[PDB]
Structures are given as structure tokens and as C-alpha cells.
């Protein structure tokens, strides 16, 4: 139906947003201001998004779902129009900030329409197509923006944002919220400062301080939806597996940038053609299948640390076995969360499931990188790599053990 046809247009408003991150050198000359200041400028999108998606979901919960999805898609016009209009330093900041709060509005609200769309059985067709929207949307955000920068430029990648954000609409109470964003703002850049940096132990405080001040100040959930969310976090911990693998292959074994692309796009095509098999797979069975078969995905790439001549076989099967496992768990976990969550409080509950997904990644990457960067500094590339891949196996096993607290 044209229920998802518009929704995916709002998820592709978050492909164009996270494509410009991989084309920072082009707009450093245009906007003029040096790298390091213009980089953090583009960073603000997923920054503002991660801290407001909870609130913007809880305000969409009351103010209206399609009301907020109308706000977001309208705010996605100015978000892109502001940047593409004129390139200059101070303006570039604000343009990404609103691009960030634009996503915070869309994600939880469009996740609530899906429950109204079906309310059982024909909901899995929608949530699967939603997963295609995000995983395809993020999966090629880089490979797109780069291909666009080559021929057309950095300008014609953000004019596609306004027109798709309109075509989407064509198919259409501060209870510590301020001490929530301050905990997230900090926690979001505790992983980034964790690598860079002191504010290393200093910024961990304002997270823990604004956590307990927010703990005793909408917190009300007790169902398997909790299990589906906690499992989602632990599974996204093995996101680092891919980045540490791409590094190892391209630096250690010394392949070209295109080979890295073929191994990666193989994983991308696989995972997008399993979320389809995910809905057919269904709750606990496929999520146990996914959380398990991903751990194999690692093991095949872990064993490439002790390689041979025909271990490109053992590495490839890894990318496939890793890719499909995410796809299998992909469309059942989003359902088990979206279903069990109360119809009254969907906007609040969905934002929490999406952030728990977000932090999981950033958290996993930080560990995977730090371990790799440490282990490769201590011992070698091949050795140090496996140490990082192993740390992912543990999280992937914990994600398989995280299903223990998720009954049928």
C-alpha cells in the first residue's frame, strides 16, 4: 500500500542526512571554515536526533503521530534548504541541528502509524518495508553521497532531500526531558571523547548525575518488549565486527577499496533479503537464530586471523552469515517491540527501542575500535584484529543470552 510508500520517504530523509558525513572535504572549501570544526558541525545531526527522539516521540505521543510526521517532513525541507541555500560556517551548524530534531520527530511517530496500518499480521509487511527503508538508507549513505559528489557534486545530494520529503507528505510536559538530553548529549560524546580523551572521567559524571536526577523524576514498562529492546542493544554491539573486519582486510591483508565494497555490499544485499524471510520466520525462535548465526558470521572472519590462500572463502561466508543473521532478527524484534508496547504509549516506547538500537551501535564500535587500536598496538594486525573480533563474539553471545529474558 501507499502507507509505507510515504513512510520510507521519511526514512530516506535520513539517508541524505548521513551521506554528507562521508563528503566533508568538498564542503570544507565551500563553507570555508577548517576541518575539525565543520566536521563536528555535520556530526550534530545524529547527535541532536539521539537525545530528542525519546522526547519528540513522547510529544508525538500526545500532539499527534501524523501531526509530528508532518512537522518532521516539513522540518526536513528547511533542514536541507537552509544548508543547500548558502554555504557559510555559523549557518551550517543550525541547518544540521534542525536536521537532527527532524529525525527525532519522524522515527517514533511513523513507527506508530504502522500499528494503525495493520494492528496484527499485515503489520510485519510494513515493519519489514520500514527496515528496508533504514538499513538500505544507512547501508548506502556513504557509497551514495560519494557517487553523487563525483559526477554532480555535494549540492545535488541535498536537493534530493527537499523533493523526497515533500513526496512523502504527498502520500500523507518537560518531565526531566532537559536532564534526559544532558545525559544523552554527554553519553553520546562519552564514546567519542572515550577515543579522543580530562573530560573522559569528567563527562561520565554528567551522564551518571543527569541519570539519577532523571531516574527519580515516562518510566513505566514491564513486558517482553523490554527483553526485545535489551536484546536489540546487545546485538548492535557486534556492529563493530564489520568496521574492524573492513580495516583488517584493507590494512592487514592489503586489498583495494572496491574489494572492501564487494564484501560489504554482499552483506548489505544479504541482510535486506532476510528481513523479508524474518516476517515469514514468525518471535523468540528467529531472534535466537539471528543472535546465534551472527556469532558464526564473526567466527568465520575471526579464523581469517589464522588464514590460508582459500580463506577469502572463510571471510566471505562470514559477511553472508553475519548479514543474514541481522536480517532474520531484523523484522521479528521490531515487531515484538511494536506489538507488546501499549497502543496509548507507542510514540514513547518506540523512541526508547530506537535509541537503545542507536547507543548499542556507537557503544559497540567504541569497544571494537579501542580493543583493535589497543590489541594491534600491543601485538600485531592479524593478532590484534582477532582480539577485537572475539570481544564482538562475547557481545553476540550476550545478545543470544539476552533472549533468555524474552519469553514467547
Amino acid at each position, epitope marked *: 500500500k501507499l502507507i509505507l510508500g510515504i513512510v520510507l520517504g521519511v526514512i530516506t530523509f535520513w539517508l541524505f542526512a548521513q551521506s554528507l558525513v*562521508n563528503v*566533508v*572535504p568538498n564542503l570544507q*572549501q565551500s563553507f570555508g571554515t577548517d576541518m575539525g570544526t565543520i566536521s563536528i558541525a555535520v556530526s550534530l545531526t545524529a547527535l541532536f536526533s539521539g537525545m530528542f527522539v525519546v522526547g519528540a516521540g513522547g510529544l508525538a505521543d500526545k500532539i499527534g503521530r501524523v501531526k509530528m510526521t508532518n512537522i518532521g517532513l516539513l522540518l526536513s525541507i528547511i533542514g536541507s534548504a537552509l544548508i543547500i541555500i548558502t554555504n557559510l560556517p555559523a549557518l551550517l551548524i543550525l541547518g544540521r541541528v534542525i536536521q537532527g530534531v527532524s529525525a527525532a520527530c519522524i522515527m517514533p511517530s511513523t513507527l506508530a502509524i504502522m500499528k494503525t496500518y495493520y494492528q496484527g499480521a499485515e503489520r510485519q509487511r510494513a515493519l519489514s518495508y520500514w527496515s528496508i527503508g533504514s538499513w538500505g538508507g544507512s547501508g548506502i549513505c*556513504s557509497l551514495f553521497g560519494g*557517487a553523487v559528489a563525483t559526477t554532480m557534486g555535494w549540492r545535488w545530494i541535498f536537493i534530493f532531500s527537499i523533493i523526497v520529503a515533500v513526496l512523502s507528505m504527498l502520500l500523507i510536559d518537560v518531565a526531566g526531558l532537559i536532564v534526559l538530553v544532558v545525559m544523552l548529549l554527554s553519553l553520546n560524546v562519552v564514546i567519542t571523547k572515550g577515543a579522543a580523551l580530562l573530560w573522559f572521567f569528567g563527562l561520565i559524571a554528567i551522564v551518571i548525575v543527569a541519570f539519577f536526577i532523571f531516574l527519580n523524576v515516562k518510566l513505566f514498562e514491564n513486558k517482553p518488549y523490554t527483553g526485545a529492546t535489551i536484546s536489540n542493544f546487545l546485538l548492535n554491539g557486534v556492529a563493530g565486527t564489520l*568496521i574492524v573486519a573492513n580495516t583488517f582486510v584493507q590494512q592487514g591483508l592489503g586489498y*583495494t*577499496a572496491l574489494q*572492501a565494497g564487494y564484501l560489504s555490499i554482499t552483506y548489505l544485499i544479504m541482510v535486506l533479503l532476510m528481513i523479508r524471510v524474518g516476517e515469514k520466520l514468525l518471535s523468540k525462535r528467529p531472534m535466537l537464530l539471528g543472535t546465534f548465526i551472527v556469532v558464526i558470521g564473526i567466527a568465520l572472519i575471526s579464523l581469517v586471523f589464522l588464514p590460508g590462500i582459500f580463506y577469502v572463502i572463510s571471510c566471505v561466508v562470514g559477511y553472508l552469515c553475519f548479514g543474514l543473521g541481522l536480517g532474520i532478527y531484523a523484522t521479528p524484534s521490531t515487531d515484538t517491540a511494536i506489538s507488546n508496547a501499549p497502543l496509548d504509549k507507542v510514540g514513547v516506547a518506540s523512541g526508547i527501542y530506537k535509541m537503545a538500537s542507536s547507543l548499542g551501535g556507537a557503544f559497540g564500535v567504541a569497544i571494537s575500535g579501542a580493543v583493535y587500536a589497543g590489541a594491534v598496538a600491543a601485538t600485531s594486525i592479524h593478532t590484534g584484529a582477532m582480539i577485537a573480533l572475539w570481544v564482538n563474539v562475547l557481545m553476540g553471545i550476550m545478545a543470544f543470552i539476552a533472549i533468555l529474558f524474552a519469553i514467547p
Partner: nanobody
Amino acid sequence: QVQLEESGGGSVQAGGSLRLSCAASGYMYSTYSTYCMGWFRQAPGKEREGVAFIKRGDHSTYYTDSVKGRFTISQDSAKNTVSLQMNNLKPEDTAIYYCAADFAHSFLLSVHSGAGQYSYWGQGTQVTVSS
């Protein structure tokens, strides 16, 4: 937290040859990304000038006019490091050579040269030539 440990260089007679190596510690690649890497020279007289740069992903090299043909930047992929093999060195080449690398980007995007783009810099290695 990405150190650039650089080695080689030093003094030699004019019309001679010199090696300059530089590796990047704990610099990881994103899902469809790479980074560009090379040297800038700066004699006590003139200001910071670009020499030779290479895109780590697909050996996409770029040189300045001055050094074109004599200098040959390249990456020892198995040992993981870039190195600028300099030849027929003229006394203009006498300066402090700084190994640098820019923030990562889509591998589809082209190699970089402008000092504004490069963000990671090495302590600097000295090279001098004479009669």
C-alpha cells in the same frame, strides 16, 4: 588518538636520493571509506608547501610540479605504510618534511592536497642536500 610515526630522511649530496617512510597507528576504515596521506615541506624561508599524496584505498597518487618524476610516493600494502622515494634532489628540496593524513571520506571521492583538508600531522622529519 591516531599517531603518525614517520622515519627516514636526513642529509645527502645534491643530485642524490633519499627515502621517507610514514605509517598511521590505529586509523580504522568506515564501511565504504578510506583516507589520503602524504608529505608537506617547509624550509626556514618559504611557507608550508605540498609535495606528494596517495589515497590509501586504491593507490591514487598525486604529486606537486617541483618534485614530479624524481619523487615517487607509494604504500607498502603488506607492511602497511606510505613512503616517498626522492631522487636527483636539488637544494630547493632542503626543508623539514611533515607526514600528514586527512579525516576519512567515501573512497569514490578523489585524492586531496590542500593543507586545510589534512588534519593529522607528524612531528616532522628533516632532509637537507648540498654540493
